[PDB]
Ligand binder design. Structure first.
Ligand SMILES: *[C@@H]1O[C@H](CO)[C@@H](O[C@@H]2O[C@H](CO)[C@@H](O[C@@H]3O[C@H](CO)[C@@H](O)[C@H](O)[C@@H]3O)[C@H](O)[C@H]2NC(C)=O)[C@H](O)[C@H]1NC(C)=O
Ligand SMILES: *[C@@H]1O[C@H](CO)[C@@H](O[C@@H]2O[C@H](CO)[C@@H](O[C@@H]3O[C@H](CO)[C@@H](O)[C@H](O)[C@@H]3O)[C@H](O)[C@H]2NC(C)=O)[C@H](O)[C@H]1NC(C)=O
Ligand SMILES: NC[C@@H](O[C@H]1O[C@H](CO[C@H]2O[C@@H](CO)[C@H](O)[C@@H](O)[C@@H]2O)[C@@H](O)[C@H](O)[C@@H]1O)c1ccccc1
Ligand SMILES: *[C@@H]1O[C@H](CO)[C@@H](O)[C@H](O)[C@H]1NC(C)=O
Ligand SMILES: [Fe+3]
Ligand SMILES: [Zn+2]
Ligand SMILES: [Zn+2]
Length: 340
């Protein structure tokens, strides 16, 4: 009745979802799929209600008829006086990151280097950087630009998956879910941190959250911001503090999507759920916190302050915006569920 089946992608999200289900008196239950695309299908069938998505998947879901419901909102230095749930979303910065020690590596000498992507089809890890590379290159052969990569979601046998490591046992190599060691923002950044790749396509927040003691993980423990450099499009290299002037693009925030006939219901349930387990929530941190998962960004990014209303009741094209939407169309002409 006032119920939403959340779609978890992978066993680790399934685990976090089950805790949330317990804690919500089952006002929220869970469905699990191996990929984000399969989750989108369960929602289309009506077997799951919603899940939080990167802009790149919002475009996929968007063509299949799903709509953005609420968006992730993180800390701000403006729009401070108004509440988080009513505050407009600012978007994040897609950046290219390298080690300072890898001197002379610039945006112009990326050909034949090793890359770390969050996953195929994602905004900062794939659509933006590959879109730029296909445009600058006049060729749709992005499968040959980098010598080796870890781009979760690609053909496990291709060079685009050579750098991926799989799980603690070597299985699930290159799967586009957290079982794959170098998946998502954290994984792609770990891929560069462990010097597996030369460059990581992540967002600007990732660098800051996994350096200078912010993360207590074993591989991030000793990482220092000064040991990293951002690659700008003009050919320069800048400190990570200069992201506002050295990013590849500003990306629309990840957002919760659902089938439109369920949008209203999913919205109400979620606003109540964050009042309980949110940042200033009734039951967080003592019983449960929806937006924490020890740096793993399970279900939601860990730096989320709240899920905000959209208002202007935007379709997915308006949400993603005309600039971003045309970018994806361009890149995809290089190659239901395939919905339009
Ligand atoms: C890769 O190159 C393509 C082709 O140039 C880029 O797409 C182009 O993007 C611009 C800006 O988004 C579009 O211009 C816009 O045109 C509309 C009217 O058509 C106008 O109202 C806007 O003010 C703006 O001038 C252009 O239409 C679009 N071209 C195509 C064929 O889609 C694309 O953005 C590049 N990809 C990346 C990631 O940079
Ligand atoms: C690049 O991404 C990082 C990570 O999100 C951004 O740095 C963060 O900046 C915010 C403010 O914009 C800081 O939030 C504030 O922290 C202070 C405590 O130091 C507190 O007064 C506020 O209540 C709020 O929590 C945040 O601390 C900081 N993150 C870290 C770990 O330094 C940065 O703004 C992004 N830059 C670009 C170009 O987007
Ligand atoms: N508020 C987001 C808007 O969506 C459209 O806006 C982004 C740009 O977002 C700006 O947001 C403000 C705060 O709202 C920040 O201060 C700026 O730094 C950001 O650039 C567009 O690029 C994109 O087209 C997007 O669709 C929105 C308004 C109302 C309802 C839903 C979304
Ligand atoms: C379950 O949903 C009902 C209906 O809104 C609400 O009153 C109750 O607080 C919810 N229980 C929990 C623990 O979320
Ligand atoms: Fe993203
Ligand atoms: Zn810009
Ligand atoms: Zn509209």
């Amino acid at each position: 009745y006032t119920r939403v089946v959340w779609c978890a992608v992978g066993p680790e999200e399934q685990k976090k979802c089950q805790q949330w289900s317990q804690q919500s008196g089952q006002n929220v239950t869970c469905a699990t799929a191996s990929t984000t695309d399969d989750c989108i299908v369960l929602v289309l069938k009506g077997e799951a209600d919603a899940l939080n998505l990167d802009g790149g998947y919002i475009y996929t879901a968007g063509k299949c008829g799903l709509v953005p419901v609420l968006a992730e909102n993180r800390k701000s230095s403006k729009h401070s006086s108004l509440d988080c749930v009513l505050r407009p979303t600012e978007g994040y910065l897609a950046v290219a990151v390298v080690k300072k020690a890898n001197e002379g590596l610039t945006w112009n000498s990326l050909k034949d280097k090793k890359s770390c992507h969050t996953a195929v089809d994602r905004t900062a890890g794939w659509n933006i950087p590959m879109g730029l590379i296909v445009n600058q290159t006049g060729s749709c052969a992005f499968d040959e630009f980098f010598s080796q990569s870890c781009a979760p979601g690609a053909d496990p046998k291709s060079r685009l998956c050579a750098l991926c490591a799989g799980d603690d046992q070597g299985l699930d190599k290159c799967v586009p879910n957290s079982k794959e060691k170098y998946y998502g923002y954290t994984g792609a950044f770990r891929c560069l941190a462990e010097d597996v790749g030369d460059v990581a396509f992540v967002k600007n927040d990732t660098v800051w959250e996994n350096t200078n003691g912010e993360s207590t993980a074993d591989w991030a423990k000793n990482l220092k911001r000064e040991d990293f450099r951002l690659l700008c499009l003009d050919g320069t290299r800048k400190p990570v503090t200069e992201a506002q002037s050295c990013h590849l693009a500003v990306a629309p925030n990840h957002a919760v999507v659902s089938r439109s006939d369920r949008a209203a219901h999913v919205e109400q349930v979620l606003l109540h759920q964050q009042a309980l387990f949110g940042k200033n929530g009734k039951n967080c941190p003592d019983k449960f916190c929806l937006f924490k998962s020890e740096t793993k960004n399970l279900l939601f990014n860990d730096n989320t302050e709240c899920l905000a209303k959209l208002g202007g009741r935007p379709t997915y094209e308006e949400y993603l915006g005309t600039e971003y939407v045309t970018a994806i169309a361009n890149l995809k002409k290089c190659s239901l569920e395939a919905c339009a």
